[PDB]
Amino acid sequence: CQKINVKQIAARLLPPLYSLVFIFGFVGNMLVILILINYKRLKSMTDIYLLNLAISDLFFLLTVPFWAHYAAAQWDFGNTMCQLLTGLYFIGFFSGIFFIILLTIDRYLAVVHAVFALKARTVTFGVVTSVITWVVAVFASLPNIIFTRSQKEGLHYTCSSHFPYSQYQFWKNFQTLKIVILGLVLPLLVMVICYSGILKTLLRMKKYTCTVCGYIYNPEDGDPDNGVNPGTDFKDIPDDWVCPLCGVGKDQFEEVEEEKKRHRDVRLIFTIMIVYFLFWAPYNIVLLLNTFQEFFGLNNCSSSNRLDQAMQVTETLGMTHCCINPIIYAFVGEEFRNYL
Ligand SMILES: Cc1nnc(C(C)C)n1[C@@H]1C[C@H]2CC[C@@H](C1)N2CC[C@H](NC(=O)C1CCC(F)(F)CC1)c1ccsc1
Numbered sequence: 001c002q003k004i005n006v007k008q009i010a011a012r013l014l015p016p017l018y019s020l021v022f023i024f025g026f027v028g029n030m031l032v033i034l035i036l037i038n039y040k041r042l043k044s045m046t047d048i049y050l051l052n053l054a055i056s057d058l059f060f061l062l063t064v065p066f067w068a069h070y071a072a073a074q075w076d077f078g079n080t081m082c083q084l085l086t087g088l089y090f091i092g093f094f095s096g097i098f099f100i101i102l103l104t105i106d107r108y109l110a111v112v113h114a115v116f117a118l119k120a121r122t123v124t125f126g127v128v129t130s131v132i133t134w135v136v137a138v139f140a141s142l143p144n145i146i147f148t149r150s151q152k153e154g155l156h157y158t159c160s161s162h163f164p165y166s167q168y169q170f171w172k173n174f175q176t177l178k179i180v181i182l183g184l185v186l187p188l189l190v191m192v193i194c195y196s197g198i199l200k201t202l203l204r205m206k207k208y209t210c211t212v213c214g215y216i217y218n219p220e221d222g223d224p225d226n227g228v229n230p231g232t233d234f235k236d237i238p239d240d241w242v243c244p245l246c247g248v249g250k251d252q253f254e255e256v257e258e259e260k261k262r263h264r265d266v267r268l269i270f271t272i273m274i275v276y277f278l279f280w281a282p283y284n285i286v287l288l289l290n291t292f293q294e295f296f297g298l299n300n301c302s303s304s305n306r307l308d309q310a311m312q313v314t315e316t317l318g319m320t321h322c323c324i325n326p327i328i329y330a331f332v333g334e335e336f337r338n339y340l
């Protein structure tokens with residue numbers, strides 16, 4: 001068996017691709033950072049988390065031109081930069097998802113537990129949680145920065161991670177589960193718990209009109225005369241209940257179209273999380289497949305080279321995501337459109 005040489009392809013394909021993701025990302029993110037302070041004026045907890053999410057992206061973007069040069073030639077920046085850039089990449093990766101989860105839990109706290117929302121959703125506490133988030137991200141990145149060095153291999157310089165020989169398999173497995181759990185498994189649980197909890201709180205809030213007379217059932221008012229307590233969802237009401245005006249069943253009732261512009265905050269943060277999974281989930285799956293190829297997949301010569309190739313391709317897609325977040329704000333968020 002023998003591995004494949006991708007240097008010839010990558011030295012042609014990666015430098016113009018990376019440079020453009022950089023141009024479009026640096027410009028895109030700086031526009032976001034500026035508009036959040038100079039127009040939006042950081043009024044809520046969302047504004048603090050979205051700001052830090054754009055900083056984590058810029059941190060990721062700062063490393064991009066260095067990767068473009070390394071792909072095209074070699075590592076001409078030394079050891080200091082090698083660790084410092086792999087650092088900003090990891091710190092930028094972890095804090096990025098960490099702030100998306102904090103933007104998810106935030107919407108779960110605003111929709112559900114509305115009484116606790118107004119009580120504990122300050123700008124000062126938002127900054128405090130943000131300081132501790134950037135710290136946790138650093139500690140998560142820390143082992144990966146340490147085992148990264150820039151070494152000369154024959155006539156070429158490299159900037160890669162080299163785990164300790166004696167415990168090579170343990171660090172390979174431990175770092176795989178740390179990236180996969182904190183980047184896919186953990187936020188995926190948060191996306192399931194929160195958004196199903198938000199949707200069930202939203203659903204209760206919907207108003208239903210009688211298609212016969214026009215009676216609008218408000219959940220907040222209910223129907224005490226017939227025995228329907230206030231707050232109760234229309235769907236949750238027994239079928240035997242009739243219209244308090246004409247006397248028709250729940251079947252001859254339709255959903256009132258909603259101006260989901262309150263829920264525009266929920267609709268945007270949902271797109272940030274969903275689109276994060278289109279760029280980062282393919283890499284996270286392949287990472288688990290490549291590390292656990294023996295006893296959990298195909299360990300053969302051909303399949304291993306295919307897995308390593310798929311890992312580079314899917315980490316290239318994941319990297320591209322740092323320039324994608326402004327496009328979501330430009331389309332989903334009506335506020336960003338109003339600035340132009
Ligand atoms: C070079 C280059 N050219 N284009 C890229 C990407 C921009 C595509 N790069 C480099 C490849 C490397 C090294 C720094 C940064 C950027 N990448 C981190 C990978 C990391 N993954 C790992 O360290 C795992 C590897 C497999 C394992 F050992 F089994 C477990 C750990 C990571 C962390 C968060 S996302 C990816």
Ligand SMILES: [Zn+2]
Pocket residue numbers: 210212213214215243244245246247248
């Ligand atoms: Zn009626």
